[PDB]
Amino acid sequence: MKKLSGGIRTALAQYRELAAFSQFASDLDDATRKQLDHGQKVTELLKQKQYAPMSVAQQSLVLF
Amino acid sequence: MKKLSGGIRTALAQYRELAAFSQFASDLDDATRKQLDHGQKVTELLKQKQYAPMSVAQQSLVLF
Amino acid sequence: IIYDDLSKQAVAYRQISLLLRRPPGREAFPGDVFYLHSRLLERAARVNAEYVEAFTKGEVKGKT
Amino acid sequence: AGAKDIRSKIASVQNTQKITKAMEMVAASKMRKSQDRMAASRPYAETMRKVIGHLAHGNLEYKHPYLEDRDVKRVGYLVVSTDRGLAGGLNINLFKKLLAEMKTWTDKGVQADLAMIGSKGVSFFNSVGGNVVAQVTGMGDNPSLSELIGPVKVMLQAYDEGRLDKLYIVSNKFINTMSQVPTISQLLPLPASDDDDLKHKSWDYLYEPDPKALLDTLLRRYVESQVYQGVVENLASEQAARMVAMKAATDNGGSLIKELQLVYNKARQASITQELTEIVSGAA
Amino acid sequence: TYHLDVVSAEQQMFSGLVEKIQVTGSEGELGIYPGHAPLLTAIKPGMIRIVKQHGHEEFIYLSGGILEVQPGNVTVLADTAIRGQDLDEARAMEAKRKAEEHISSSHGDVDYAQASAELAKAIAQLRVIELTKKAM
Amino acid sequence: QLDPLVVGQEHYDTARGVQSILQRYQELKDIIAILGMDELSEEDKLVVARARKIQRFLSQPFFVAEVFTGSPGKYVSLKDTIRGFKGIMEGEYDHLPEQAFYMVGSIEEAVEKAKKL
Amino acid sequence: QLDPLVVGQEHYDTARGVQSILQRYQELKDIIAILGMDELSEEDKLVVARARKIQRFLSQPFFVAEVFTGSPGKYVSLKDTIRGFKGIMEGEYDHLPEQAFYMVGSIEEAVEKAKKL
């Protein structure tokens, strides 16, 4: 987990302000479009049902 | 008066909802400019001098 | 160990303190509300093998 | 006042700072694009002017109306204005300059006439009461030459019909990212080329069908192209002005948080003190 | 080969060297080989045939324009839309009409509109200057 | 209790759909103010129309409010509520005017009111 | 004592107009602070300039304050001040720099001070 989760936190911290910029800016640079859609994929990935805990294997695989 | 005041309530309601734009009035579409300019006028209509009471007929006439 | 709400332990302590006439402090919480949570959460600790051995009188040696 | 109202106001001012900080970036990117679209526009006019020069006042010349300084009995202006506020002083400086020159002209008893690009100027000159004869609005950030044909068609028709004697375009000039200047400049009759095409001596064109019919269309297309270039430069200046306006607004919001927070701390301390003193000095 | 430029009032539409071209000039179909004498003519709307060096043909559709084949450089000053008199007079009447009816359309900037609306709503009833004692 | 396991996927989906239409309409309000409605997309105008119809349809005439307005009260089952809001969201009533939903009650009374308008 | 009956309609109306203008200027002070003055509508830029002229014209030199400013004091009759404020509001002095109004007794002295800047 230490190896596969290095960037996640700061990546999301930046993506959540870039998504706040995004509302007023259409016609976004493709460079930032990539980052926005990736942050969105990961944010959609981390949500979880209320009683479905994951073993370290499953979490590490999904984060891989 | 019960009949006539129903429209005053809604005129002032929509005016209070649009008031934020009164400072950017030039940008607005004319479809809302009419609502804002009707609100300002019904607001200017409710002003009244001291010791000058209106009988119910005069109030109803002016609100009509 | 999970304390379902330390926020309500503080309120219960504020009550049981004011009812004893003890002088209050900020937000009417007793003077030592910090000491209340401090001396509780400072028990959550990892404890080395020598302490475990000495407390249990040599009955356990390898464990922390 | 009270801690809660001041904290709500602080939250709203931070939100305002976010909005302006975003508008600045949007305006900067649009400024780059709108001056690329400006750089792209030069070659057409740059070559059309050479052709017109050679035909008009080279070794040979023709006597088209648009080239001779007839008597000025009334003047027309083509006015470029933004379609979006928050540009700073861009539009009002330009309109004040125009009003001063139109004052000068009307003093001599010569009338003035106006055609408006963009809606800001339309509203302004409706309020002041200037005579507006044709207008196009709502071009926004996608100016296209097929839309400018209308008003310049009107002004040209009124020029060669004898009802104008001089025609100007007033617009902003994008000089540096930090500075832009309003300019009134003449485009009928045609201003004087710095260069000489005496070196074109050696050759002349093969006109099909004849040069007189071609010079007319060349001059019309050149006027339209200059009006288009003016529109695009005014658009780039609009973006560069909105950018600095939003930068200053972000800095002013930032310098206002630092006052609202002092007021907030003062109210927080006063409320703590009053509550705790009421309790203690009430007991016993 | 010679250097051809096809430029609109807005954007450049082509460039490079060319072997020859075929244009439908105003007085009739026409073909410009290298070294052609200086010629100036209007051209009717339609396709312009290019054969780029190494024979690579391509067609560009030109709504019209003025062709100027100078001694070494032929440049086509194409335009963006069909031009005539029946049309430009329609546009001029429409502009006379819009100004006269006092009709004004909205811009298309759906971004500036949202930004401006959020900025106007956030700044309303803020009363900050009455609250911090800024003298002003 | 608003989660699928207790109310069922039908109720949960209808509720989240209503909230989505109203949230989007809130966004569209300021664009409609500034630029005007005729600039909206051809789908967005449909969102505006359906959001306003949903908004009108949430009002209801109460039996105990008859003394304020004289109009008779209505009792609306849950089945009728879900059926109505789902039908509105899926365009089955795009042909009725907005006011046909105001203080209406059940959805059938909306068509009976629109016939009168 | 500020009633139409007690002080006459002209005095009362001038006072209320001054209040209205200054309050309208207060309401703009925050938008001026954030967005700068160039965003104000042309109608609301006139209000601001007249508000500031009025702010300065309420200043006056006092005979007991010569010790501080050196300038001689002034005594302004009521008839002479309601006229100056009617003028400033109606616009008949709307071509004069603000500092023409700082520490002057009567409007005459302001139009006279403007000659010296």
Cα E135 to its chain centre, rounded Å, is 53
List, in order, residues 6 or more apart from D226 with CB less than 8 Å away: D45, D169, D187
CATH of the domain at E69: 2.60.15.10
- Of the candidates D205, D234, D257, which is a domain's last residue? D205
Q: Pick the closest to residue F36 from E110, E111, G74 (CA basis).
A: E110
Helix (H, G, I), strand (E, B) or coil at C53: helix
Cα A12 to its chain centre, rounded Å, is 5
List, in order, residues 6 or more apart from D74 with CB less than 8 Å away: D110, D111, D112, D113, D163, D164, D165
Residue D166, CA distances (Å) to D71, D171, D190 in order = 9, 17, 10
Q: Do D124 and G33 touch (CB under 8 A)?
A: no
Reduce the secondary structure of chain G to three states and give it as a string.
Answer: CCCHHHHCHHHHHHHHHHHHHHHHHHHHHHHHHHHCHHHCCHHHHHHHHHHHHHHHHCCCCCHHHHHHHCCCCCCCCHHHHHHHHHHHHHCCCCCCCHHHHCCCCCHHHHHHHHHHC
Q: Pick the closest to residue D189 from D102, D60, D70, D272 (CA basis).
A: D70
Touching chains A and D? (3+ Cβ pairs < 8 A): yes
Exposure class string for F39-59: b at 16+ Cβ within 10 A, else e:
bbeeebeebbebbebbbbbee
Backbone angles phi, psi at B3, to 5 degrees: -65, -50
- Structural method: cryo-EM
Question: CA-CA distance, D64 to D159, in Å (whole number)?
Answer: 12
CATH of the domain at D77: 3.40.1380.10
The contact set of E with A (CB < 8 A) is: 110-111, 114-115, 118
Helices and strands, number each (H, E), in chain C: 3, 0
Q: Pick the closest to residue F96 from F28, F55, F50 (CA basis).
A: F50
Amino acid symbol at D149? I
Helix (H, G, I), strand (E, B) or coil at D225: helix
List, in order, residues 6 or more apart from D79 with CB less than 8 Å away: D94, D98, D114, D115, D116, D117, D121, D125, D170, D171
Closest-CA distance, D188 to chain E, in angstroms, reads 19
Are D182 and D171 in contact, with CB atoms under 8 Å apart? yes
CB-count burial class (<10 Å; 0-12, 13-18, 19+) for E128: buried
Are E28 and E43 found together in one domain?
A: yes
Are D94 and D198 found together in one domain?
A: yes
Are D113 and D146 found together in one domain?
A: yes
Amino acid symbol at G19? Q
Placement of tokens 């479905």 in the chain: A52
- Domain count for chain E: 2
A52-57, long-range: CB < 8 A, 24+ apart: A56/A1
Are D116 and D100 found together in one domain?
A: yes
Are E80 and E118 found together in one domain?
A: no
Residue E20, CA distances (Å) to E2, E43, E69, E73 in order = 8, 16, 12, 12
Closest-CA distance, E13 to chain D, in angstroms, reads 11
- Of the candidates D205, D230, D256, which is a domain's last residue? D205
Resolution reading in Å: 3.3
Question: CA-CA distance, D143 to D233, in Å (whole number)?
Answer: 11
DSSP string, D249-274: HHHHHHHHHHHHHHHHHHHHHHHHHH
Under DSSP, the state recorded for C57 is T
Residue D11, CA distances (Å) to D188, D241, D247, D257 in order = 56, 27, 19, 9
Are D48 and D67 found together in one domain?
A: no
What's the longest Cα–Cα distance across chain A? Answer: 41
Are E2 and E22 found together in one domain?
A: yes
- Residues from chain D that touch C21, judged by Cβ atoms under 8 A, are 283
CATH of the domain at F88: 1.10.1140.10
* For testing contact with chain E, the best of D38, D127, D152, D208 (most E CBs within 10 A): D208
Closest-CA distance, G70 to chain D, in angstroms, reads 36
Taking residue F22's Cβ as centre, other Cβ atoms within 10 Å add up to 15
Both ends of chain D: CA-CA distance in Å? 32
Under DSSP, the state recorded for D73 is S
Peptide bond into F4 cis (omega under 30): no
User: Which residue range forms the structural domain that includes residue D270?
Assistant: 1-59+206-284
Q: Pick the closest to residue D25 from A22, E12, E38 (CA basis).
A: A22
Question: CA-CA distance, G37 to G30, in Å (whole number)?
Answer: 10
Are A43 and A12 in contact, with CB atoms under 8 Å apart? yes
User: Which residue range forms the structural domain that includes residue F93?
Assistant: 2-117
Are E82 and E99 found together in one domain?
A: no
Pairing assessment for the beta strands D206-208 and E39-43 based on DSSP bridges: parallel
- Domain count for chain G: 1
Question: CA-CA distance, G41 to B27, in Å (whole number)?
Answer: 11
Residue E77, CA distances (Å) to C3, D89, E34, E69, E95 in order = 80, 37, 19, 11, 26
Give the bridge partners for C11, in sequence order. Answer: none
- Domain count for chain D: 2
Are D56 and D190 in contact, with CB atoms under 8 Å apart? yes
Are B40 and B15 in contact, with CB atoms under 8 Å apart? yes
Cα G35 to its chain centre, rounded Å, is 25
Q: Do G31 and B26 touch (CB under 8 A)?
A: no
Question: CA-CA distance, F107 to F113, in Å (whole number)?
Answer: 10
Under DSSP, the state recorded for E37 is P
Chain F neighbours (≥3 Cβ pairs under 8 A) are B, E
The contact set of G with E (CB < 8 A) is: 26, 29-31, 33-35
Backbone angles phi, psi at E18, to 5 degrees: -145, 150
Are E10 and E71 found together in one domain?
A: yes
User: Which residue range forms the structural domain that includes residue E73?
Assistant: 1-87
Taking residue G58's Cβ as centre, other Cβ atoms within 10 Å add up to 11
